[PDB]
Design an enzyme around this catalytic site. Structure first.
Site, PDB file in Angstrom:
ATOM      1  CG  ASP A  16      -0.242  -0.162   2.521  1.00  0.00           C
ATOM      2  OD1 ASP A  16       0.958   0.115   2.649  1.00  0.00           O
ATOM      3  OD2 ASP A  16      -0.928  -0.558   3.470  1.00  0.00           O
ATOM      4  NE  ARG A  30      -0.943   3.012   4.322  1.00  0.00           N
ATOM      5  CZ  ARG A  30      -2.135   2.412   4.261  1.00  0.00           C
ATOM      6  NH1 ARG A  30      -2.930   2.459   3.199  1.00  0.00           N
ATOM      7  NH2 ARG A  30      -2.576   1.723   5.348  1.00  0.00           N
ATOM      8  CG  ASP A  35      -3.572  -1.947   6.858  1.00  0.00           C
ATOM      9  OD1 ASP A  35      -2.450  -1.592   6.458  1.00  0.00           O
ATOM     10  OD2 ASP A  35      -3.732  -2.487   7.972  1.00  0.00           O
ATOM     11  CB  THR A  36      -1.315  -4.402   1.928  1.00  0.00           C
ATOM     12  OG1 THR A  36      -0.303  -3.351   2.070  1.00  0.00           O
ATOM     13  CG2 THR A  36      -2.147  -4.192   0.632  1.00  0.00           C
ATOM     14  CD  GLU A  38       4.317  -2.870   8.337  1.00  0.00           C
ATOM     15  OE1 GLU A  38       3.328  -2.144   8.288  1.00  0.00           O
ATOM     16  OE2 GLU A  38       5.384  -2.675   7.756  1.00  0.00           O
ATOM     17  NE  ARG A  82       2.248   7.119   5.033  1.00  0.00           N
ATOM     18  CZ  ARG A  82       1.885   5.965   5.570  1.00  0.00           C
ATOM     19  NH1 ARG A  82       2.466   4.801   5.257  1.00  0.00           N
ATOM     20  NH2 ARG A  82       0.898   5.887   6.471  1.00  0.00           N
TER      21      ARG A  82
HETATM   22  C1  THP Z   1      -4.675   5.299   4.914  1.00  0.00           C
HETATM   23  C2  THP Z   1      -4.369   6.321   5.990  1.00  0.00           C
HETATM   24  C3  THP Z   1      -3.445   6.036   6.977  1.00  0.00           C
HETATM   25  N1  THP Z   1      -3.204   7.009   7.901  1.00  0.00           N
HETATM   26  C4  THP Z   1      -2.282   6.770   9.027  1.00  0.00           C
HETATM   27  C5  THP Z   1      -3.029   6.081  10.206  1.00  0.00           C
HETATM   28  C6  THP Z   1      -1.899   5.158  10.763  1.00  0.00           C
HETATM   29  O1  THP Z   1      -1.028   5.799  11.752  1.00  0.00           O
HETATM   30  P1  THP Z   1      -0.055   5.257  12.842  1.00  0.00           P
HETATM   31  O2  THP Z   1       1.146   4.718  12.088  1.00  0.00           O
HETATM   32  O3  THP Z   1       0.343   6.398  13.736  1.00  0.00           O
HETATM   33  O4  THP Z   1      -0.845   4.116  13.406  1.00  0.00           O
HETATM   34  C7  THP Z   1      -1.013   4.791   9.548  1.00  0.00           C
HETATM   35  C8  THP Z   1      -1.399   3.510   8.840  1.00  0.00           C
HETATM   36  O5  THP Z   1      -0.520   3.314   7.678  1.00  0.00           O
HETATM   37  P2  THP Z   1       0.291   2.042   7.469  1.00  0.00           P
HETATM   38  O6  THP Z   1      -0.578   0.842   7.136  1.00  0.00           O
HETATM   39  O7  THP Z   1       1.245   2.405   6.324  1.00  0.00           O
HETATM   40  O8  THP Z   1       1.166   1.753   8.666  1.00  0.00           O
HETATM   41  O9  THP Z   1      -1.191   5.911   8.639  1.00  0.00           O
HETATM   42  C9  THP Z   1      -3.847   8.201   7.917  1.00  0.00           C
HETATM   43  O10 THP Z   1      -3.573   9.041   8.769  1.00  0.00           O
HETATM   44  N2  THP Z   1      -4.791   8.469   6.975  1.00  0.00           N
HETATM   45  C10 THP Z   1      -5.048   7.585   6.050  1.00  0.00           C
HETATM   46  O11 THP Z   1      -5.945   7.832   5.183  1.00  0.00           O
HETATM   47 CA    CA Z   2      -0.122  -1.393   5.679  1.00  0.00          CA
END
Ligand code: THP
Ligand code: CA
Length: 136
Positions: A16, A30, A35-36, A38, A82
């Site tokens: 993702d 992103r 959510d893919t 980790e 991102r």
């Molecule tokens: C998809 C998305 C993720 N995020 C944030 C929430 C999560 O934060 P935290 O890392 O602080 O938990 C993280 C999830 O992305 P990842 O799946 O890349 O880790 O990115 C947003 O803020 N808005 C979004 O639309």
């Molecule tokens: Ca992810």
């Protein structure tokens, strides 16, 4: 109304997250609403289907003739800098493709950026019903 803008692949990072050249500058994007599993953070480690999701996205963006980004109506970046968008490879939404294959789940649904929510939820139900990958 949402609109698609051109971009150029730099590098696929995981299922993702991809790096693109957008309006002449390198940026990490992103994918919205999914959510893919980790593959990088020390927490939870390398989740199941992580590698597969990564491989799927990589192949899709690397083989495309054209990549487009489509921002939603709310914030365009997350707290990590991102870009938040729907990404298309030859007019096919990567976000949806992943859900349809059971390589991602619908997640991080923020009321400000949820235009394609229903569309993705329909694809997710189908993958569930076919018991694919994550849903197997
Ligand atoms: C998809 C998305 C993720 N995020 C944030 C929430 C999560 O934060 P935290 O890392 O602080 O938990 C993280 C999830 O992305 P990842 O799946 O890349 O880790 O990115 C947003 O803020 N808005 C979004 O639309
Ligand atoms: Ca992810």
């Amino acid at each position: 109304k949402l609109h698609k803008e051109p971009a150029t692949l730099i590098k696929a990072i995981d299922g993702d997250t991809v790096k693109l050249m957008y309006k002449g500058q390198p940026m990490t994007f992103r994918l919205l609403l999914v959510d893919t599993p980790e593959t990088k953070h020390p927490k939870k480690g390398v989740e199941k289907y992580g590698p597969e999701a990564s491989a799927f996205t990589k192949k899709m963006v690397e083989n495309a003739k054209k990549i487009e980004v489509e921002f939603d109506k709310g914030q365009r970046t997350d707290k990590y800098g991102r870009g938040l968008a729907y990404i298309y490879a030859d007019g096919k939404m990567v976000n949806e493709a992943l859900v349809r294959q059971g390589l991602a789940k619908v997640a991080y649904v923020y009321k400000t950026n949820n235009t394609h929510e229903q569309h993705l939820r329909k694809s997710e139900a189908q993958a569930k019903k076919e018991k694919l990958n994550i849903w197997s």
